[PDB]
Amino acid sequence: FNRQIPAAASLIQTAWRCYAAENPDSSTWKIYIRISQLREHHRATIKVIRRMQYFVAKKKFQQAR
Amino acid sequence: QLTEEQIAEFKEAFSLFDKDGDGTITTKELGTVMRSLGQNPTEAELQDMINEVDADGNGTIDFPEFLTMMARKMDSEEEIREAFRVFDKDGNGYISAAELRHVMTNLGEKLTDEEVDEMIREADIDGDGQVNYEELVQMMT
Ligand SMILES: [Ca+2]
Ligand SMILES: [Ca+2]
């Protein structure tokens, strides 16, 4: 029932999470519970990972259409 | 503009992924990083992430492919806009904060309430809970 509804959601969330990460003080950083304290090497790999996830979510949306 | 301070930062960012030092990011190394951050990804997720960046199809990511991937900007704004439309029931260009939070926190990647708050706090214009999502498309681009 509409394979676009989940894909559209993941495109927005990943695009937002990709944007929100440029703010070092956004609440989107609070989700990495299993880290005792975010060092700056964590942030570098998180930015990279979140840009990849957006590309995947981008492509998945275009495919559902 | 093709920055140079950025290439350094990206060099350092590539290294955290390429533990080897062989100049290549494989899915194993990418899941090693993700798992260290508290994420349990599936190889379908890892392979999709590599496929999006692996521009020559050899199944791994070398540094120039990394560069391309970081060097991109966001028009992807019409895809995002269309993504929002899927949830604009009234077709008005608006989504209610209650509905936004409901679909954001319960579908897809599942944002947290504070994360959604930042969205709502960013694009309300009128403080009556009507989220102007064209403002979001605009903020992220
Ligand atoms: Ca390697
Ligand atoms: Ca490659």
UniProtKB/Swiss-Prot annotation, chain B:
Q: Where in or outside the cell?
A: Cytoplasm, Cytoskeleton, Spindle; Cytoplasm, Cytoskeleton, Spindle pole; Cytoplasm, Cytoskeleton, Microtubule organizing center, Centrosome; Cell projection, Cilium, Flagellum
The entry marks the following residues as binding Ca(2+) 3, namely: 88, 90, 92, 94, 99
Q: Which GO terms describe its biological process?
A: autophagosome membrane docking; calcineurin-mediated signaling; cellular response to interferon-beta; cellular response to type II interferon; detection of calcium ion; G protein-coupled receptor signaling pathway; G2/M transition of mitotic cell cycle; long-term synaptic potentiation
> What is the location of the Glycyl lysine isopeptide (Lys-Gly) (interchain with G-Cter in SUMO2) cross-link?
19
Does Calcium show up as a keyword for this record?
Answer: yes
The UniProt record gives the binding positions of Ca(2+) 2 as 54, 56, 58, 60, 65
> What is the first-listed, main subcellular location in coarse terms?
cytoplasm
InterPro entries on file: CALM/Myosin/TropC-like, EF-hand-dom_pair, EF_Hand_1_Ca_BS, EF_hand_dom
Instruction: Report the Pfam families cross-referenced here.
Output: EF-hand_7
Segments carrying the region annotation (Necessary and sufficient for interaction with PCP4) are 74-141
**Phosphotyrosine modifications at:** 94, 133
UniProt activity-regulation remark: (Microbial infection) Inactivated by S.flexneri OspC1 and OspC3 proteins, which specifically bind the apo-form of calmodulin, thereby preventing calcium-binding and activity.
Binding sites annotated in the UniProt record for Ca(2+) 1: 18, 20, 22, 24, 29
Q: How is it modified after translation?
A: Ubiquitination results in a strongly decreased activity.
The segment(s) forming the EF-hand domain are: 5-40, 41-74, 75-110, 111-141
Q: Give the Gene Ontology MF terms in alphabetical order.
A: adenylate cyclase activator activity; calcium channel inhibitor activity; calcium channel regulator activity; calcium ion binding; calcium-dependent protein binding; protein kinase binding; protein phosphatase activator activity; protein serine/threonine kinase activator activity
Cross-link Glycyl lysine isopeptide (Lys-Gly) (interchain with G-Cter in ubiquitin), sequence positions? 19
N6-methyllysine is found on 110
Q: How does it assemble?
A: Homotetramer. Interacts with MYO1C, MYO5A and RRAD. Interacts with MYO10. Interacts with CEP97, CCP110, TTN/titin and SRY. Interacts with USP6; the interaction is calcium dependent. Interacts with CDK5RAP2. Interacts with SCN5A. Interacts with RYR1. Interacts with FCHO1. Interacts with MIP in a 1:2 stoichiometry; the interaction with the cytoplasmic domains from two MIP subunits promotes MIP water channel closure. Interacts with ORAI1; this may play a role in the regulation of ORAI1-mediated calcium transport. Interacts with IQCF1. Interacts with SYT7.
User: What family is reported?
Assistant: Belongs to the calmodulin family.
- Any domain commentary? The N-terminal and C-terminal lobes of CALM bind to the C-terminus of KCNQ1 in a clamp-like conformation. Binding of CALM C-terminus to KCNQ1 is calcium-independent but is essential for assembly of the structure. Binding of CALM N-terminus to KCNQ1 is calcium-dependent and regulates electrophysiological activity of the channel. The C-lobe interacts with KCNN4 channels in a calcium-independent manner, whereas the N-lobe interacts with the S4-S5 linker of KCNN4 in a calcium-dependent manner playing a role as calcium sensor and gating the channel.
Other facts: This protein has four functional calcium-binding sites.
Q: State what this protein does.
A: Calmodulin acts as part of a calcium signal transduction pathway by mediating the control of a large number of enzymes, ion channels, aquaporins and other proteins through calcium-binding. Calcium-binding is required for the activation of calmodulin. Among the enzymes to be stimulated by the calmodulin-calcium complex are a number of protein kinases, such as myosin light-chain kinases and calmodulin-dependent protein kinase type II (CaMK2), and phosphatases. (Microbial infection) Required for Legionella pneumophila SidJ glutamylase activity.
Q: What is the disorder linked to it? A: Ventricular tachycardia, catecholaminergic polymorphic, 4: An arrhythmogenic disorder characterized by stress-induced, bidirectional ventricular tachycardia that may degenerate into cardiac arrest and cause sudden death. Patients present with recurrent syncope, seizures, or sudden death after physical activity or emotional stress. CPVT4 inheritance is autosomal dominant.
Q: What is this protein called?
A: Calmodulin-1
Q: Which source organism does the UniProt entry give?
A: Homo sapiens
Give the gene name.
Answer: CALM1
